[PDB]
Amino acid sequence: DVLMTQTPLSLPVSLGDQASISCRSSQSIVHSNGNTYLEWYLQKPGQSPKLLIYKVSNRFSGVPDRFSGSGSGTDFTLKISRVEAEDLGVYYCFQGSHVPLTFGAGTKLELKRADAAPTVSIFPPSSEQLTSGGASVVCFLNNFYPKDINVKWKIDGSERQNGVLNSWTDQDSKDSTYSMSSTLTLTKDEYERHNSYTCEATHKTSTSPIVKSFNRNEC
Amino acid sequence: QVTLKESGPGILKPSQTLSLTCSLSGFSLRTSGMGVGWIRQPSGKGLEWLAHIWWDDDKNYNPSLKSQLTISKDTSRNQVFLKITSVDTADTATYYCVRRAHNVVLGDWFAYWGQGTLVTVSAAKTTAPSVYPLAPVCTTGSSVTLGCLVKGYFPEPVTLTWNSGSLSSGVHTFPAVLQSGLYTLSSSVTVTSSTWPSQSITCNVAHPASSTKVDKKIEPR
């Protein structure tokens, strides 16, 4: 397979700035017939992808000239001269030369804003859930920036890695922060067996982790 | 105008045989150098190319899934089809019908994408959620965050509101995730500490497919 590596996978911009997106292929994407079928697609949230550029540098009809594609061989770049608000979304490169046809993983064009540390809230299992025989502990980590965050669960001082489900919101359109939910789901038996519950988040905004805990027995 | 319109089943069980249809208008499967493909996308994941078919009945396939894949067409109705056998939860995705021509003149590029048809592969029966309140732990600060947990439902969607929608800011409602088999979603609401528990708060969770409507008052510990 021709692997299509995009760099970066997250591009923070301010509106009006210049944006460049790298796509490098693991094999030459020159077809035998002479053409290089390298394309660029933009997918806006809740829409289907659109063609911006074909064969390296050909803009598709009605795509404005602030977009340009360049490169040769294995190395390709999409460039946005001045980024508009409508240009945000996920950008894919694509090679239509070799079977299987392959897309890059996508590069998310996201807004720059000031760093924002997460507000961490931890929540024990409800009585309602417990009367059922299961036990979910919930940690909300809201309104942080950048999106990079490491969340671990600890039970009685030790890390837990099985049973954890995570969900992230997209970038908020009003304040540009991100938010995340983490749920440790245990059996009620297991929950009643252990006492100390901790959700901790390491985010670039602090040297030390945000630690939020509770002890079951005091609830 | 040139339109492509995808139809699918919406929902099938693992092992079952997915049948997609793409109904074409504003061009024919009949010119020399004409083709239509299938590309798919799981939610919050990338694009995968599946198969392509040409005016001359030549077919290209994704090697990963060649044994499960069959693509065909009907030039009369202007339609193209994709069949995927022995499907599984991994084949949960949005499936797009796209046009691509072998020639420069007609369109050597995915210029025309349909809106996509969602295909959910799940063994699950319709299942109502359980709706758990999340009260703060046993204070002293400006904001207090309350939560609501909606667990073990199928199919999508549930809708969630705080106080019947009358509390609409400071809310975060997270995308549904899979555990089983079944979906779980959670929501948080952050209000000024003077508000709660003085002024009451309730998450209102509907799951239409099971006729479920649950109003769950966040009670302080």
Q: What is the resolution of this structure in A?
A: 2.3
> What tokens appear for A143 in the block?
């309104």
Q: Which of A73, A93, A113 is the last residue of a domain?
A: A113
Chain B residue with minimum CA distance to A215: B137
Instruction: Quickly count: other Cβ atoms within 10 Å of residue A215's Cβ.
Output: 14
Q: Residue B9 in contact with residue B119, Cβ under 8 Å?
A: yes
Task: Answer yes or no: is A95 within a domain.
Answer: yes
**Structural biology method used:** X-ray
| Contacting residues of A for B64, CB less than 8 Å apart | 100
Q: Which of A57, A86, A113 is the last residue of a domain?
A: A113
Residues of chain B whose beta carbon is less than 8 angstroms from a beta carbon of chain A are 46-49, 52, 60-64, 96, 100, 108-111, 113-116, 130, 132-138, 143, 145, 147, 149, 151, 172, 174-177, 179, 184-186, 188, 190, 221
The three-class DSSP label of residue B63 is helix
Instruction: Quickly count: other Cβ atoms within 10 Å of residue B6's Cβ.
Output: 23
Contact A142 B188 (CB under 8 A): yes
Asked whether the CA dihedral A75, A81, A83, A88 is positive or negative, the reply is negative
> What tokens appear for B187 in the block?
């929501």
Q: DSSP letter at B91?
A: G
Task: Answer yes or no: is A219 within a domain.
Answer: no
> What tokens appear for B149 in the block?
């947990």
Contact B172 A106 (CB under 8 A): no
Into how many domains does chain A fold?
2
CATH number of domain containing A41: 2.60.40.10
Task: Answer yes or no: is A99 within a domain.
Answer: yes
Of B109, B134, B172, the CB nearest to A142: B172
Contact B132 A101 (CB under 8 A): no
A11 shares its domain with A108: yes
Q: Which residues of B55-76 are buried (b: 16+ CB within 10 A; e: fewer)?
A: beeeebbbeeeeebbbbebeee
| Contacting residues of A for B151, CB less than 8 Å apart | 129, 136
A108 shares its domain with A178: no
Contact B63 A100 (CB under 8 A): yes
Report the alpha-carbon distance of residue A21 to residue A40 in Å, rounded. 10
Domain with CATH 2.60.40.10 in chain B: 1-123, 124-220
| Contacting residues of B for A140, CB less than 8 Å apart | 145, 147, 172, 186, 188
- Full residue range of the structural domain in which residue A149 is found: 115-214
A107 shares its domain with A144: no
H/E stretch holding A94: strand A89-95
Among A11, A10, A12, A8, residue whose Cα is nearest residue A112? A12
Please report, for residues A96, B67, B72, B79, B177, the alpha-carbon distance to residue B30 in angstroms, rounded to integers and kept in the order given. Answer: 22, 27, 14, 11, 43
Rounded (5°) CA angle A50-A56-A62: 40
Phi, psi of B65, deg, nearest 5: -125, 25
Q: Which of A113, A146, A168 is the last residue of a domain?
A: A113
Cβ contacts from A onto B, under 8 A: 130
Q: How many residues does chain A have?
A: 219
Tell me the CATH number for domain B1-123: 2.60.40.10
Report the alpha-carbon distance of residue B132 to residue B147 in Å, rounded. 9
Please report, for residues A184, B132, B154, B221, the alpha-carbon distance to residue B203 in angstroms, rounded to integers and kept in the order given. Answer: 21, 9, 19, 17
Report the alpha-carbon distance of residue A94 to residue A39 in Å, rounded. 5
Q: Residue B23 in contact with residue B77, Cβ under 8 Å?
A: yes
Tell me the CATH number for domain B124-220: 2.60.40.10
H/E stretch holding A127: helix A127-130
> What tokens appear for A129 in the block?
């859930």
A105 shares its domain with A9: yes
* CA A216 centroid distance within chain: 33
Please name the residue that has the structure tokens 């599946």: B50
When computed from its CA atoms, the radius of gyration of chain A, rounded to whole angstroms, is 23
Task: Answer yes or no: is A39 within a domain.
Answer: yes
A98 shares its domain with A1: yes
A163 shares its domain with A205: yes
- CA terminus-to-terminus distance, chain B: 62
